[PDB]
Amino acid sequence: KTAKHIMQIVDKEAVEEVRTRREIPEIRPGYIVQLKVEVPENKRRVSIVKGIVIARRNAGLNSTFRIRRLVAGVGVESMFPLYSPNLREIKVLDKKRVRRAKLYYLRDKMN
């Protein structure tokens, strides 16, 4: 119990450390977000990524979210850690009305 309590304390402090240096907006399923992603594998190449949030998981500093988009006609799904330092900027562009927390039916959608 004390071990898990220590993990929770350290995670809470780590999350509050990040949120006082960078601005991270609230991200929900169905949100159209645009973000700039630095990929350190590809010589730290920065690209702009835009898509609809289809999934989210709240796990403290290791919270994740998933983005579905079309790139040159091919559907590309990307999962990002929310507090990753390689996300330079996150903007929320639009909010679609959805009824659920996971939108995996969008993969079977024609568009």
């Binding site: 119990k1 004390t2 071990a3 898990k4 220590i6 350290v10 350190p40 594998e41 010589k43 730290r44």
Partner: protein, 190 residues
Amino acid sequence: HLTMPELGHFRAQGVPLKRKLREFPVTEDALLPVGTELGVRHFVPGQYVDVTGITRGKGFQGVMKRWKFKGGPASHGCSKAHRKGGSTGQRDDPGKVFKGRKMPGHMGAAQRTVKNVWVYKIDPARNLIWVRGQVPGAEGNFVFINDACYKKPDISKLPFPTYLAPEDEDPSELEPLVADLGEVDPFMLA
């Protein structure tokens, strides 16, 4: 919480009552007096350590989980031998099963060591060490940390025989120490 013999051992050594005891072999110059407090500043961030603990228990286990045996087919006539070990020897020469034949039995809850475990961060205020990757054992169980044998740490950098803090030292004033990674970007020279 203690039996009377253990309580008497602590009483006659003149030390406060402890939950876990472990003995470490040392050289003669590395001895410390009874009652010396050891903190996380024994280790230097960036060094490698060996971590020993009792692994996760798995109970009684079959050959497929315990030894990665392949088992049998799920169809094509196979009769009640889907997860079994198959043959356990040869016929009459040797006429016996050899020692060490991999069979079902208890798995896990055993002592194992992970070598060359990298120390990322030292937090001396809370006596916490951040160390990269997995460590054997359950949460809340005890592990034992030594210098790494394979990647031996630098002799001139280790606090010997231990880090001896002054008593005029505040718990609030110590800041965490992170391993120095250098100034050469590993993603930009490739």
